[PDB]
């Protein structure tokens, strides 16, 4: 449990940036697409239970 | 490899209009090195 929880903690703060860049650029959107494609939201929402 | 680096540097400044002061201080550093290399290449050929 410690491992996988800590890994997603890393890839939640390794996010591209706050919306200061994500709303006025097109480079950071490439990174956001990658990390979002590795953690499906359907399973993630159910894990908080 | 140095030539591929300067040409590269050019694209980063292709869309701007004025080169800031720290965009020239480093740039002149590289071009001075390239001149010294070119001087050497001549002196292996001079005196056929």
């Amino acid at each position: 449990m410690s491992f996988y929880a800590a890994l997603i903690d890393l890839l939640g703060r390794c996010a591209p940036e706050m919306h200061l860049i994500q709303a006025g650029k097109g480079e950071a959107l490439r990174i956001r697409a990658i990390l979002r494609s590795l953690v499906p939201l359907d399973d993630l929402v159910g894990i908080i239970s | 490899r140095l030539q591929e680096s300067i040409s590269d540097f050019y694209w980063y400044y292709s869309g701007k209009d004025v080169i800031e002061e720290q965009g020239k201080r480093n740039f002149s550093k590289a071009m001075s090195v390239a001149k010294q290399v070119f001087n050497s290449l001549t002196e292996y050929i001079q005196g056929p």
Binding site: G26, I34, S37 | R1, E4, D8, W11, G15
Partner: protein, 220 residues
Amino acid sequence: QFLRTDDEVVLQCSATVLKEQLKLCLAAEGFGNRLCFLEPTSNAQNVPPDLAICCFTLEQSLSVRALQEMLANGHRTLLYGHAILLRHAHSRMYLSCLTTSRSMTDKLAFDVGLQEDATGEACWWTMHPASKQRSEGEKVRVGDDLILVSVSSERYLHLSTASGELQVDASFMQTLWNMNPICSCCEEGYVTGGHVLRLFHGHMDECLTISAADSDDQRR
């Protein structure tokens, strides 16, 4: 001698199945199937391979920077580390990578597909040398071995085999691709292979043909 821009070429991969090597190329039909599949070319002496849709062509070659600065807005020679823009010759559509889900591998598969993507976001690849013999900034010898990586998604184009048949995607590891110079800038007014053309006979108006449509002769 060496690869150049505006040249028509074909991809090639080699993966044994029955303990014997089978050559597999990459091709897609175009109109009606945005996906891509594999075409075996191991029994040319008996099975005629379909090379009408396997032809590709190289149109652009740029450094990564140059690409990224162009994103905001002759004849060169390929070097390892540069980018590339594939282009299917027949359907005139650009090879790219889609964002759909499929294949056993699934996971980060992101199955390959070509739609229209002239817009430069996911239609570009960078190539790297396979073994330690080569290095960056070196000229590309004809018949080398390449490793291709998507610029956008950053996944190797993987020959992902599974329980079913052989499928292609970009998920997990490397895939050794060997290039192949189908042709180059030919001379004008001379017959070359792979053309589609008519056969006149006689002097003025006579040509080869087959029987007309809507008949039981089965065009024999």
